[PDB]
Design a protein around this ligand. Sequence first.
Ligand SMILES: *[C@@H](O)[C@H](C[C@@H]1CCNC1=O)NC(=O)[C@H](CC1CCCCC1)NS(=O)(=O)CCCOc1ccc(OC)cc1
Length: 174
Amino acid sequence: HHHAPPTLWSRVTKFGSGWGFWVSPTVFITTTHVVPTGVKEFFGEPLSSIAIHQAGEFTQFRFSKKMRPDLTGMVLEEGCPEGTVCSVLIKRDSGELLPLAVRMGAIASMRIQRLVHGQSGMLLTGANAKGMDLGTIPGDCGAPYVHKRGNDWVVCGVHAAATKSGNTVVCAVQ
Ligand SMILES: *[C@@H](O)[C@H](C[C@@H]1CCNC1=O)NC(=O)[C@H](CC1CCCCC1)NS(=O)(=O)CCCOc1ccc(OC)cc1
């Protein structure tokens, strides 16, 4: 019994000051502000072998080398389906897997603190998701927002922000 399968969890990878997500053997997505700056390589590969595209808080890497050939390609949607329940696949650095149910709101332009093209959502984990047990916390950014379309899991955003209440979260979308 699980919520998300082991292979889906294995796509969530530590990166910079947060996480990213292997969409495919070659495509990696993350949140812009956790990405290392001023570096010459990512995952050992020189920049010249990585197509890099950062738009707002959404960063995509496409590697020339097949970096995760164990994986199949999954669909990256252009945003999450508004009004539907997704799961945020939080890994914590102490080892926990913390999938957080979230009902997704509207895609909107936002400026938290930078220009965010993001989508808000409401966590469905408790009355007020403050703290580590029921919500998102510093270090969680880059975690994928996923949902299942039919029998297949889809990814639609990466974790970017949350209010101090914790109940509202924001993912960056493509
Ligand atoms: C990940 O690095 C971290 C996650 C966040 C911290 C606290 N709980 C979380 O889930 N994200 C941040 O710290 C985030 C970073 C900015 C950097 C520039 C681009 C946007 C993200 N800052 S913050 O502390 O999360 C912002 C707090 C308020 O955020 C919101 C969210 C929704 C909203 O709806 C109206 C208003 C403000």
